[PDB]
């Protein structure tokens, strides 16, 4: 009863950020780690142990 | 040369495991798996032990004519989402208490009817046959004979009762009790036949606690299920 109200009050008072910043951060991470992924960028047959 | 040696080790170990799976596949193909399901206070507890102890989660083993069967209970879940793991069984056994129609306050039978209807139309259980058991025969007979409680008040469609033609009453039985029993049987078979589609069926049986012939009944029904499946496989039925 009262514990539910206390928990709801605890969760309500949480700082937030603009969605633009989060989208920019996600795009930055995706751009930064683009080269490493073999699924995204093809790799030579020699480097592939599955051939 | 150590590398060659290690490849040699892997081959020999695959060699034992591969052999072991083959022995195992034969046993898993020999046995048949059943699912036991019923409402509360139905008498599933009576059926699991009273029938198997003489014949010889909860997994039960019994042998009939040197043919392996394996029965799973459901332990002691208004929603049912684990039922998707039971779409490869041979048959599903349904046990419902026949005597509890007046007792409640939705009539308990009505809840059992709703459960049976929901199970019948499940997407994952489109090709699973149901063996239906009706317990509490003597209680039902005693309630019908010299009983203050009336079927019509609880179930209003009973007003028109005509024992179904081809009625085969047991010896020395009053017509009223048979007309009562066949009403419930037809009520369940209506739901069974509404969307049968010819792929799966429902087998009505009447039983009590004392009788032990049900173990042979299950065997005969399983044989019939396999026969009908094979006949439909080759476009003969």
């Amino acid at each position: 009863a009262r514990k539910l109200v206390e928990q709801l009050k605890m969760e309500a008072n949480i700082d937030r950020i603009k969605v633009s910043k989060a989208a920019a951060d996600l795009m930055a991470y995706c751009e930064a780690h683009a080269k490493e992924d073999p699924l995204l960028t093809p790799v030579p047959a020699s480097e592939n142990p599955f051939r | 040369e150590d590398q060659r040696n290690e490849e040699k080790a892997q081959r020999e170990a695959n060699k034992k495991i591969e052999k072991q799976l083959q022995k195992d596949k034969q046993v898993y193909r020999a046995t048949h798996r059943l699912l036991l399901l019923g409402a509360g206070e139905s008498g599933k507890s009576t059926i699991v032990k009273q029938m198997r102890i003489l014949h010889v989660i909860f997994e039960t083993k019994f042998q009939v004519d040197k043919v392996n069967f394996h029965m799973f209970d459901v332990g002691g879940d208004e929603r049912r989402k684990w039922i998707q793991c039971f779409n490869d069984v041979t048959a599903i056994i349904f046990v419902v208490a026949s005597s509890s129609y007046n007792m409640v306050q939705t009539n308990r039978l009505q809840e059992a009817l709703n459960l049976f209807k929901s199970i019948w139309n499940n997407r994952w259980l489109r090709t699973i046959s149901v063996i239906l058991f009706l317990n509490k025969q003597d209680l039902l007979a005693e309630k019908v004979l010299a009983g203050k409680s009336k079927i019509e008040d609880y179930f209003p469609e009973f007003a028109r009762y005509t024992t179904p033609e081809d009625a085969t009453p047991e010896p020395g039985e009053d017509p009223r009790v048979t007309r009562a029993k066949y009403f419930i049987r037809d009520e369940f078979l209506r739901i069974s036949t509404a969307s049968g589609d010819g792929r799966h069926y429902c087998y009505p049986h009447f039983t009590c606690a004392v009788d032990t012939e049900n173990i042979r009944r299950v065997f005969n029904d399983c044989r019939d299920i396999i026969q009908r499946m094979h006949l439909r496989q080759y476009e003969l039925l």
């Binding site: - | 078979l189 026969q227 094979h230 006949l231 080759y234 003969l236 039925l237």
Partner: protein, 287 residues
């Protein structure tokens, strides 16, 4: 009569393309897709193999011979051709018998079907059956145990341009009995039992739930038995009768009935591969 001879070439040539196409399609469908790898489907694979040889090895040479009316190869080659023809013919029926017996075990013995038939036993049965087909086919025909005795026969063996079928009574009777007469009673008995079981099940279901609720089985059994009996029955009685008494059946009737017999290889895929799984397999590839 240029038009008639030319027209016959059109009919014989079409009959071989269909035979090749059907069997190669069935074989590719069985081999490529792993969901069709089933104990029963091995027999269909074998049956198909025998037909392909008949379509590729026997039919075109016979058509060329009946068109030219003069055999242009060696005597050893025509003996080999006869051996190949008899091998394919006597191997294209035992497979049907085996399939019928397998269906009998699958329907009338539901609780022991898995144990009785395994992936290992199917190979044993296939190897054993193809072997018998060879023993009648090559051992008597290659060694000259089967040569006839009358003057015309010997005149044809001596000549290097004619090669026709002349045999004694014993070989003809034995080959006919081994190839056709034995595998008929077994199939009849099997299908009668299966039909009885189907009728029993239909009566049971009608008694159980007739109020709220044999044609398909009759139609299917009628097709599967009638096509085979019609295709292969007349030849295996004409074969006996022309040896029992001579100067009764002329050569053209014999050849016509024999060629009627050869058509049976073009219908087995149409009958034994009508399941929806085969339909979706055919739609998946080359479609």
């Amino acid at each position: 009569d240029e038009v008639w001879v030319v027209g016959m070439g059109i009919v014989m040539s079409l009959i071989v393309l269909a035979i090749v196409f059907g069997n190669v399609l069935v074989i590719t469908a069985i081999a490529k897709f792993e969901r069709l790898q089933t104990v029963t489907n091995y027999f269909i694979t074998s049956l198909a193999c025998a037909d392909l040889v008949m379509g590729l090895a026997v039919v075109p040479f016979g058509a060329a011979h009946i068109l030219t009316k003069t055999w242009t190869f060696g005597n050893f080659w025509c003996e080999f051709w006869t051996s190949i023809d008899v091998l394919c013919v006597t191997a294209s029926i035992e497979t049907l018998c085996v399939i019928a017996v397998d269906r009998y075990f699958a329907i009338t013995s539901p609780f022991k079907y898995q144990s009785l038939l395994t992936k290992n036993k199917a190979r044993v049965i296939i190897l054993m059956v193809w072997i018998v087909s060879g023993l009648t086919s090559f051992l008597p025909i290659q060694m000259h145990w089967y040569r006839a005795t009358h003057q015309e026969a010997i005149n044809c063996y001596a000549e290097e341009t004619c090669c026709d079928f002349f045999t004694n009574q014993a070989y003809a009777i034995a080959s006919s009995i081994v190839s056709f007469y034995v595998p008929l009673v077994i199939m009849v008995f099997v299908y009668s039992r299966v039909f009885q079981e189907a009728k029993r099940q239909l009566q049971k279901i009608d008694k159980s739930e007739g109020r709220f609720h044999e044609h398909k089985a009759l139609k299917t059994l009628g097709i599967i038995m009638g096509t085979f009996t019609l295709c292969w029955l007349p030849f295996f009685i004409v074969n006996i009768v022309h040896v029992i008494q001579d100067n009764l059946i002329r050569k053209e009737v014999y050849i016509l009935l024999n060629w009627i017999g050869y058509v049976n290889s073009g219908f087995n895929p149409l009958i034994y591969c009508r399941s929806p799984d085969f339909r979706i397999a055919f739609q998946e590839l080359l479609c």
